Amino acid sequence: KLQLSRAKLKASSKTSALLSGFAMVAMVEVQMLIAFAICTTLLVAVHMLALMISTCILPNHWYIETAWAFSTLLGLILFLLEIAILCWVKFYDLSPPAAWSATVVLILVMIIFMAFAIHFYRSLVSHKYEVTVSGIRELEMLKEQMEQDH
Amino acid sequence: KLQLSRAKLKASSKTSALLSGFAMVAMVEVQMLIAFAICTTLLVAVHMLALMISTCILPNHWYIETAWAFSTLLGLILFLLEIAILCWVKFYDLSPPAAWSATVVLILVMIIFMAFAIHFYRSLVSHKYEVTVSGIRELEMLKEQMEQDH
Amino acid sequence: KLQLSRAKLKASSKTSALLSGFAMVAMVEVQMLIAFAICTTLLVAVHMLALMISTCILPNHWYIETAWAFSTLLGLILFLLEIAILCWVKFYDLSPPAAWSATVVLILVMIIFMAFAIHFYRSLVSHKYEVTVSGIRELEMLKEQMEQDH
Amino acid sequence: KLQLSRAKLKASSKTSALLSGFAMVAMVEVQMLIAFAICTTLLVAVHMLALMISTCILPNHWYIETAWAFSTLLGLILFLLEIAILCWVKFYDLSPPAAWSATVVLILVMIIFMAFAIHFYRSLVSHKYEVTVSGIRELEMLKEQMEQDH
Amino acid sequence: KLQLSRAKLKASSKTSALLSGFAMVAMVEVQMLIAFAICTTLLVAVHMLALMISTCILPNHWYIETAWAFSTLLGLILFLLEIAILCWVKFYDLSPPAAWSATVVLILVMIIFMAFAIHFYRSLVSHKYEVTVSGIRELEMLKEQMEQDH
Amino acid sequence: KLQLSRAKLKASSKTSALLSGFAMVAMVEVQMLIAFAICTTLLVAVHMLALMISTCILPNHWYIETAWAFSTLLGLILFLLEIAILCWVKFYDLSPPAAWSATVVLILVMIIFMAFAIHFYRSLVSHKYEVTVSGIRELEMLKEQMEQDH
Numbered sequence: 001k002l003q004l005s006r007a008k009l010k011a012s013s014k015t016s017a018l019l020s021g022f023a024m025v026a027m028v029e030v031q032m033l034i035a036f037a038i039c040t041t042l043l044v045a046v047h048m049l050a051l052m053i054s055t056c057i058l059p060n061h062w063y064i065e066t067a068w069a070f071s072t073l074l075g076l077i078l079f080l081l082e083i084a085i086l087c088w089v090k091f092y093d094l095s096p097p098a099a100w101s102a103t104v105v106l107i108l109v110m111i112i113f114m115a116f117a118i119h120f121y122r123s124l125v126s127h128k129y130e131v132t133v134s135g136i137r138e139l140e141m142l143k144e145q146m147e148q149d150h
Numbered sequence: 151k152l153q154l155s156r157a158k159l160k161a162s163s164k165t166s167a168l169l170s171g172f173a174m175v176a177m178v179e180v181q182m183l184i185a186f187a188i189c190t191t192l193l194v195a196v197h198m199l200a201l202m203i204s205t206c207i208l209p210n211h212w213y214i215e216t217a218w219a220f221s222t223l224l225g226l227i228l229f230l231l232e233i234a235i236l237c238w239v240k241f242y243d244l245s246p247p248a249a250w251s252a253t254v255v256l257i258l259v260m261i262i263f264m265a266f267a268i269h270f271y272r273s274l275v276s277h278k279y280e281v282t283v284s285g286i287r288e289l290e291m292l293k294e295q296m297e298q299d300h
Numbered sequence: 301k302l303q304l305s306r307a308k309l310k311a312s313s314k315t316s317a318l319l320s321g322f323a324m325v326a327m328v329e330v331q332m333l334i335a336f337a338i339c340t341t342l343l344v345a346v347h348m349l350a351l352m353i354s355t356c357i358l359p360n361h362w363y364i365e366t367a368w369a370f371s372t373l374l375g376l377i378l379f380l381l382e383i384a385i386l387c388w389v390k391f392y393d394l395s396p397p398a399a400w401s402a403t404v405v406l407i408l409v410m411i412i413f414m415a416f417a418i419h420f421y422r423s424l425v426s427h428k429y430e431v432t433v434s435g436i437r438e439l440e441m442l443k444e445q446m447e448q449d450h
Numbered sequence: 451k452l453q454l455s456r457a458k459l460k461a462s463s464k465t466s467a468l469l470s471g472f473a474m475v476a477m478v479e480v481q482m483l484i485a486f487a488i489c490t491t492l493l494v495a496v497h498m499l500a501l502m503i504s505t506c507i508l509p510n511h512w513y514i515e516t517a518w519a520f521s522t523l524l525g526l527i528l529f530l531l532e533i534a535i536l537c538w539v540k541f542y543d544l545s546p547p548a549a550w551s552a553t554v555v556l557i558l559v560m561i562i563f564m565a566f567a568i569h570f571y572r573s574l575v576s577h578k579y580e581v582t583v584s585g586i587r588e589l590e591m592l593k594e595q596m597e598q599d600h
Numbered sequence: 601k602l603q604l605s606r607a608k609l610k611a612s613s614k615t616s617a618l619l620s621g622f623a624m625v626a627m628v629e630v631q632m633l634i635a636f637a638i639c640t641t642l643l644v645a646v647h648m649l650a651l652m653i654s655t656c657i658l659p660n661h662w663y664i665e666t667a668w669a670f671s672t673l674l675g676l677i678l679f680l681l682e683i684a685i686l687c688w689v690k691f692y693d694l695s696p697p698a699a700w701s702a703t704v705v706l707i708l709v710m711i712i713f714m715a716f717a718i719h720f721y722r723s724l725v726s727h728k729y730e731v732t733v734s735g736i737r738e739l740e741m742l743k744e745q746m747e748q749d750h
Numbered sequence: 751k752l753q754l755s756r757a758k759l760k761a762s763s764k765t766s767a768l769l770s771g772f773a774m775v776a777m778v779e780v781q782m783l784i785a786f787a788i789c790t791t792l793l794v795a796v797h798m799l800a801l802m803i804s805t806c807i808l809p810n811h812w813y814i815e816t817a818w819a820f821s822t823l824l825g826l827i828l829f830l831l832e833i834a835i836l837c838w839v840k841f842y843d844l845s846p847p848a849a850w851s852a853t854v855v856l857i858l859v860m861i862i863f864m865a866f867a868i869h870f871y872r873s874l875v876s877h878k879y880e881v882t883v884s885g886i887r888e889l890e891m892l893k894e895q896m897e898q899d900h
């Protein structure tokens with residue numbers, strides 16, 4: 001609980017900062033259509049907040065960890081999505097097919113990540129159930145073997 | 151306060167620096183309306199102050215730690231606010247639906263930070279009240295248990 | 301697997317963030333033909349992936365370490381490839397030998413890495429075969445000599 | 451001197467470097483009147499100096515240490531001053547009140563820095579006087595208590 | 601040999617990455633002739649590759665330390681050369697005397713540093729050989745003095 | 751040599767790299783006359799050199815430490831010099847007096863640092879010689895107490 005809270009939050013901050021500033025530089029460049037700025041700014045919302053957690057942890061009841069986790073998750077999500085939209089906007093007035101194919105090849109791999117991630121979430125719950133089952137069974141055999149020695 | 155003085159203060163500096171300089175690159179691109187530059191400049195001022203904190207605590211009255219904490223809070227707050235104004239002014243005279251919807255999501259996320267922050271403030275009151283109350287009661291039970299053998 | 305996950309995961313974040321954002325600045329610059337932005341987006345997507353892994357080890361189930369390795373590997377590989385494509389686009393309308401020779405000399409460095417990589421794959425085969433052979437043999441002579449006193 | 455030699459000096463280098471370089475990028479953007487370049491470049495001079503000390507402490511001394519301290523403080527003051535002048539010059543032919551009102555909000559915080567800084571300057575020296583006083587009194591009373599043992 | 605593998609890999613990666621990406625920013629700036637972009641990108645191949653080494657150390661074939669060494673040397677060499685070519689090309693259609701004279705003062709320093717580095721190659725071989733000499737000789741005198749009483 | 755090998759050498763490299771890349775960005779700006787590009791590239795030479803020294807300690811040649819120290823010093827000097835020359839050109843086609851007064855105030859502070867640095871350099875020599883004096887006195891009394899008491 002401690003070594004991961006310090007170690008992960010130490011280095012996550014760097015990521016958050018670079019995404020803040022580099023998505024920032026991404027914004028100020030005219031040299032979808034409207035929702036782009038929405039997505040990027042909501043990104044800045046997610047990373048700004050998760051780093052605000054990176055400030056809150058002086059005293060450091062386990063939900064706060066998961067809140068930090070899903071925060072960073074959404075951070076990486078919106079960063080990837082809106083930079084894809086940057087590959088979108090860069091190729092608009094000189095081509096309009098490149099960007100479509102961009103999201104068409106990559107977002108498929110997004111759904112790939114969602115797929116494998118939910119696979120191993122269910123693997124954690126499933127092995128929790130299996131470990132609980134076999135452990136409970138061993139506890140029962142211990143109950144009988146203990147009942148012999150009375 | 152001290153182990154947190156090393157752990158948190160080690161990491162604050164990077165955030166302050168990158169937000170300062172990348173806020174610089176944010177400023178210089180013309181190739182509300184007037185208060186934007188003001189907001190950015192006070193923002194970068196606050197981050198400068200937080201850096202002065204990152205140097206000031208060398209020889210080692212704990213409120214100064216809180217000064218760094220909520221000072222930094224204003225740091226990321228003003229950063230998000232001013233990037234909201236960047237999507238605002240940068241895409242204002244070239245579109246008016248992108249930036250409007252931007253602030254429509256951003257004012258929502260400011261209310262998100264205030265909301266969740268007061269939420270977990272109140273949660274601190276909740277588990278502090280239950281655990282503290284049971285503590286006072288248990289201390290009374292220790293008083294009775296001591297009075298029994300008199 | 302443990303200490304290497306903390307040290308390697310500790311340092312990978314820097315690579316992912318810097319190459320991601322610096323490729324970002326690469327994007328918004330016009331001052332193959334269409335698929336370039338796609339390739340860059342898969343690159344920064346991959347470094348994003350290695351970063352999401354850099355957060356993922358909270359619940360921690362051992363393939364993920366090597367998956368992290370493949371993430372960063374693809375990160376530097378594709379970063380090289382896309383900067384090669386940057387020298388492609390930058391030296392196309394002002395020369396056609398510079399960029400051609402660019403990709404033609406860098407793909408050679410690809411064949412360099414595949415060559416040395418499969419070589420040291422075979423070297424791992426060398427220590428695996430020799431260690432396995434000597435271990436099995438000493439176990440065999442020890443097996444007969446042990447059977448003498450049985 | 452030593453434990454603080456680790457704590458402050460480990461982190462100072464990164465901040466000094468990033469403020470130096472992004473002040474560099476700060477220079478090149480036209481897309482008071484003359485003293486701007488003086489203030490900004492003099493800032494970069496002071497922070498360059500702070501890096502010179504941040505390298506100099508090899509033999510591992512509070513005279514020169516305090517000299518570094520005032521160097522860095524004055525450095526950050528110059529940072530805020532010249533970045534205010536950057537927000538000034540970048541927006542000159544497009545408003546003269548926006549940046550003016552900026553300084554109207556900033557100079558308040560200038561006197562804020564001097565105000566809080568001197569408040570805890572003389573208050574800290576005052577608590578030094580209290581500690582010295584209590585020390586002299588307790589040691590003298592210990593002398594009288596020794597006269598009891600005559 | 602090992603402490604440099606851990607500590608040096610900790611710190612070298614940061615610099616190498618920054619120079620890789622900042623070489624990217626080096627690319628998109630015009631606002632020999634053709635082989636330049638190849639040279640910079642192949643440099644990024646060298647630092648990218650050395651970063652792949654910085655990933656390879658999960659189990660931690662001991663020459664790989666030396667591969668890290670000459671990899672890093674070639675990295676910084678190519679960096680200096682290609683930035684010299686940037687100082688060339690940025691000021692080419694706007695001057696032809698500045699950068700030429702630049703190389704006139706600097707490439708001499710190229711042979712200066714390669715020269716001194718190989719100088720201390722000669723010194724390292726000389727004093728390592730000298731230590732071996734003192735060992736063999738002292739072994740001879742001690743060998744005779746012990747050999748009399750055998 | 752050891753505590754500094756971990757201490758100063760651990761952190762200085764980061765700054766050196768930042769100055770390399772950000773001086774690179776310094777070059778590419780057309781908005782003295784010729785020696786500018788020379789100075790910036792020579793800066794990149796010195797900082798590259800300091801990085802090569804910070805890499806050399808793989809076999810673990812102690813003069814190289816002092817070469818590294820003066821290397822980093824010269825690095826920061828040259829960085830300041832060429833960014834000063836950019837503050838020159840930024841105020842070249844729109845004014846020529848501001849930057850003049852800037853450099854005239856900065857070179858004075860350069861000679862300030864050189865001046866006091868050699869001042870208390872000589873004081874360091876003074877405490878070395880004086881420490882030798884007190885050592886001589888205690889050693890002389892040790893000589894009398896030694897051979898006199900035989």
Ligand SMILES: [Cl-]
Pocket residue numbers: none
């Ligand atoms: Cl660090």
Ligand SMILES: [Cl-]
Pocket residue numbers: none
């Ligand atoms: Cl560290």
